[PDB]
Amino acid sequence: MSITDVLSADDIAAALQECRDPDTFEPQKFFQTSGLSKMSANQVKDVFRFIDNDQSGYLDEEELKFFLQKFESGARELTESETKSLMAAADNDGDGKIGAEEFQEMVHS
Template sequence: MAMKNLLKDDDIKKALDQFKAADSFDHKKFFDVVGLKALSADNVKLVFKALDVDASGFIEEEELKFVLKGFSADGRDLTDKETKAFLAAADKDGDGKIGIDEFEALVHE
Protein backbone atom coordinates (compact mmCIF):
# COMPACT_ATOMS: atom_id res chain seq x y z
CA MET A 1 0.00 0.00 0.00
CA ALA A 2 1.43 3.32 -1.01
CA MET A 3 1.17 6.18 1.45
CA LYS A 4 -0.20 8.35 -1.32
CA ASN A 5 -3.38 6.27 -1.29
CA LEU A 6 -4.08 7.66 2.19
CA LEU A 7 -2.05 10.85 2.40
CA LYS A 8 -1.54 13.78 0.05
CA ASP A 9 1.82 14.01 -1.72
CA ASP A 10 2.05 17.70 -0.85
CA ASP A 11 1.51 16.97 2.85
CA ILE A 12 4.14 14.24 2.81
CA LYS A 13 6.66 16.55 1.14
CA LYS A 14 5.84 19.40 3.52
CA ALA A 15 6.26 17.15 6.56
CA LEU A 16 9.54 15.67 5.35
CA ASP A 17 10.88 19.13 4.49
CA GLN A 18 9.94 20.42 7.94
CA PHE A 19 12.02 17.71 9.63
CA LYS A 20 14.92 17.53 7.19
CA ALA A 21 17.55 18.53 9.74
CA ALA A 22 19.01 15.88 12.03
CA ASP A 23 17.46 15.82 15.50
CA SER A 24 14.52 17.98 14.38
CA PHE A 25 11.93 15.18 14.26
CA ASP A 26 8.86 15.62 16.45
CA HIS A 27 6.38 12.79 15.97
CA LYS A 28 3.36 14.83 17.09
CA LYS A 29 4.07 17.65 14.65
CA PHE A 30 4.98 15.19 11.90
CA PHE A 31 1.72 13.23 12.32
CA ASP A 32 -0.23 16.48 12.13
CA VAL A 33 1.57 17.96 9.12
CA VAL A 34 1.60 14.72 7.14
CA GLY A 35 -2.13 14.26 7.72
CA LEU A 36 -2.06 11.13 9.88
CA LYS A 37 -3.97 12.69 12.76
CA ALA A 38 -6.92 13.33 10.46
CA LEU A 39 -7.15 9.68 9.38
CA SER A 40 -9.50 7.17 10.93
CA ALA A 41 -8.08 4.57 13.30
CA ASP A 42 -8.44 1.94 10.57
CA ASN A 43 -6.48 4.02 8.07
CA VAL A 44 -3.77 4.77 10.64
CA LYS A 45 -3.47 1.01 11.10
CA LEU A 46 -3.00 0.64 7.33
CA VAL A 47 -0.15 3.13 7.55
CA PHE A 48 1.31 1.10 10.42
CA LYS A 49 1.23 -2.03 8.28
CA ALA A 50 3.09 -0.20 5.52
CA LEU A 51 5.75 0.91 8.00
CA ASP A 52 6.06 -2.59 9.49
CA VAL A 53 8.53 -3.62 6.81
CA ASP A 54 9.10 -7.16 8.08
CA ALA A 55 5.36 -7.73 8.68
CA SER A 56 6.04 -8.86 12.25
CA GLY A 57 3.09 -6.94 13.64
CA PHE A 58 5.46 -4.53 15.33
CA ILE A 59 7.67 -1.62 14.37
CA GLU A 60 10.99 -2.41 15.98
CA GLU A 61 13.70 0.13 16.72
CA GLU A 62 15.61 -0.73 13.54
CA GLU A 63 12.49 -0.18 11.39
CA LEU A 64 11.68 3.01 13.26
CA LYS A 65 15.01 4.51 12.23
CA PHE A 66 13.80 4.40 8.61
CA VAL A 67 10.19 5.43 9.27
CA LEU A 68 10.41 8.62 7.19
CA LYS A 69 11.47 6.57 4.17
CA GLY A 70 8.18 4.73 4.60
CA PHE A 71 6.43 7.93 3.63
CA SER A 72 8.80 8.77 0.77
CA ALA A 73 12.08 7.45 -0.57
CA ASP A 74 13.35 11.02 -0.06
CA GLY A 75 12.86 10.75 3.70
CA ARG A 76 15.97 10.81 5.85
CA ASP A 77 16.96 8.30 8.48
CA LEU A 78 16.11 9.26 12.04
CA THR A 79 19.08 9.79 14.32
CA ASP A 80 19.58 7.36 17.20
CA LYS A 81 18.34 10.05 19.58
CA GLU A 82 15.17 10.62 17.54
CA THR A 83 14.57 6.90 17.16
CA LYS A 84 14.86 6.27 20.89
CA ALA A 85 12.60 9.23 21.73
CA PHE A 86 9.98 8.08 19.23
CA LEU A 87 10.11 4.53 20.59
CA ALA A 88 9.86 5.74 24.18
CA ALA A 89 6.79 7.84 23.33
CA ALA A 90 4.97 4.99 21.63
CA ASP A 91 6.05 1.86 23.51
CA LYS A 92 3.51 1.95 26.32
CA ASP A 93 3.96 -1.68 27.38
CA GLY A 94 7.75 -1.46 27.51
CA ASP A 95 8.48 -4.39 25.21
CA GLY A 96 10.92 -2.41 23.07
CA LYS A 97 8.72 -2.24 19.99
CA ILE A 98 5.59 -0.48 18.79
CA GLY A 99 2.43 -2.49 18.29
CA ILE A 100 -0.38 -1.47 15.99
CA ASP A 101 -2.61 -0.22 18.80
CA GLU A 102 0.27 1.70 20.38
CA PHE A 103 0.94 3.38 17.04
CA GLU A 104 -2.69 4.32 16.52
CA ALA A 105 -2.93 5.68 20.07
CA LEU A 106 0.25 7.73 19.58
CA VAL A 107 -1.04 9.24 16.35
CA HIS A 108 -4.35 10.24 17.91
CA GLU A 109 -3.13 11.38 21.35
Protein backbone atom coordinates in the same frame (compact mmCIF):
# COMPACT_ATOMS: atom_id res chain seq x y z
CA MET B 1 1.61 2.55 -3.95
CA SER B 2 -0.76 3.26 -1.02
CA ILE B 3 -0.11 6.44 0.96
CA THR B 4 1.86 8.33 -1.70
CA ASP B 5 -1.40 9.02 -3.61
CA VAL B 6 -3.91 9.30 -0.71
CA LEU B 7 -2.99 12.65 0.82
CA SER B 8 0.14 12.01 2.91
CA ALA B 9 2.46 12.96 0.00
CA ASP B 10 1.66 16.65 0.61
CA ASP B 11 1.90 16.24 4.38
CA ILE B 12 5.32 14.57 4.15
CA ALA B 13 6.46 17.31 1.73
CA ALA B 14 5.53 19.71 4.56
CA ALA B 15 7.09 17.48 7.31
CA LEU B 16 10.28 17.29 5.27
CA GLN B 17 10.68 21.08 5.36
CA GLU B 18 9.20 21.87 8.77
CA CYS B 19 11.53 19.28 10.37
CA ARG B 20 14.43 19.87 7.94
CA ASP B 21 16.94 20.58 10.68
CA PRO B 22 19.00 17.93 12.52
CA ASP B 23 17.54 16.65 15.83
CA THR B 24 14.19 18.55 15.40
CA PHE B 25 11.72 15.72 14.63
CA GLU B 26 9.02 15.96 17.33
CA PRO B 27 6.66 12.95 17.45
CA GLN B 28 3.24 14.57 18.06
CA LYS B 29 4.34 17.38 15.74
CA PHE B 30 5.21 14.82 13.04
CA PHE B 31 1.95 12.83 13.52
CA GLN B 32 0.00 16.09 13.04
CA THR B 33 2.11 17.53 10.23
CA SER B 34 2.17 14.14 8.41
CA GLY B 35 -1.68 14.05 8.38
CA LEU B 36 -1.61 10.73 10.28
CA SER B 37 -3.45 12.35 13.24
CA LYS B 38 -6.04 13.61 10.70
CA MET B 39 -6.47 10.14 9.17
CA SER B 40 -9.02 7.78 10.76
CA ALA B 41 -7.93 4.77 12.88
CA ASN B 42 -8.73 2.53 9.87
CA GLN B 43 -6.31 4.36 7.56
CA VAL B 44 -3.73 4.69 10.36
CA LYS B 45 -3.86 0.89 10.84
CA ASP B 46 -3.62 0.28 7.06
CA VAL B 47 -0.54 2.52 6.81
CA PHE B 48 1.01 0.57 9.74
CA ARG B 49 0.50 -2.64 7.73
CA PHE B 50 2.55 -0.98 4.97
CA ILE B 51 5.13 0.13 7.61
CA ASP B 52 5.71 -3.34 9.23
CA ASN B 53 7.10 -4.92 6.03
CA ASP B 54 8.39 -7.82 8.15
CA GLN B 55 4.77 -8.39 9.39
CA SER B 56 6.30 -9.62 12.69
CA GLY B 57 3.64 -7.85 14.83
CA TYR B 58 5.88 -5.19 16.44
CA LEU B 59 7.59 -2.09 14.98
CA ASP B 60 10.99 -2.89 16.51
CA GLU B 61 13.64 -0.07 16.39
CA GLU B 62 15.75 -1.66 13.65
CA GLU B 63 12.61 -2.02 11.48
CA LEU B 64 11.70 1.59 12.36
CA LYS B 65 15.13 2.36 10.79
CA PHE B 66 13.11 2.13 7.49
CA PHE B 67 9.73 3.54 8.71
CA LEU B 68 9.46 6.57 6.36
CA GLN B 69 11.92 5.01 3.81
CA LYS B 70 8.69 3.46 2.40
CA PHE B 71 7.27 6.96 1.70
CA GLU B 72 10.47 8.88 0.78
CA SER B 73 13.87 7.39 -0.20
CA GLY B 74 15.87 10.02 1.73
CA ALA B 75 13.75 10.26 4.87
CA ARG B 76 15.10 10.84 8.39
CA GLU B 77 15.13 7.22 9.60
CA LEU B 78 18.93 6.94 9.38
CA THR B 79 19.22 9.59 12.17
CA GLU B 80 18.80 7.50 15.32
CA SER B 81 18.01 10.64 17.38
CA GLU B 82 14.99 11.59 15.23
CA THR B 83 13.99 7.92 14.99
CA LYS B 84 14.23 7.64 18.81
CA SER B 85 12.21 10.86 19.25
CA LEU B 86 9.49 9.06 17.25
CA MET B 87 10.06 5.80 19.21
CA ALA B 88 10.08 7.64 22.58
CA ALA B 89 6.54 9.01 22.28
CA ALA B 90 5.18 6.10 20.20
CA ASP B 91 6.25 3.66 22.93
CA ASN B 92 3.48 4.24 25.51
CA ASP B 93 5.15 1.54 27.72
CA GLY B 94 8.81 2.30 28.28
CA ASP B 95 9.93 -0.95 26.55
CA GLY B 96 10.68 0.27 22.98
CA LYS B 97 8.96 -2.52 21.03
CA ILE B 98 5.99 -0.54 19.62
CA GLY B 99 2.72 -2.35 18.83
CA ALA B 100 0.28 -1.19 16.13
CA GLU B 101 -2.02 -0.37 19.06
CA GLU B 102 0.66 1.88 20.65
CA PHE B 103 1.16 3.64 17.31
CA GLN B 104 -2.64 4.00 16.78
CA GLU B 105 -2.87 5.61 20.27
CA MET B 106 -0.07 8.09 19.57
CA VAL B 107 -1.34 8.88 16.07
CA HIS B 108 -4.98 9.08 17.30
CA SER B 109 -3.91 11.94 19.59
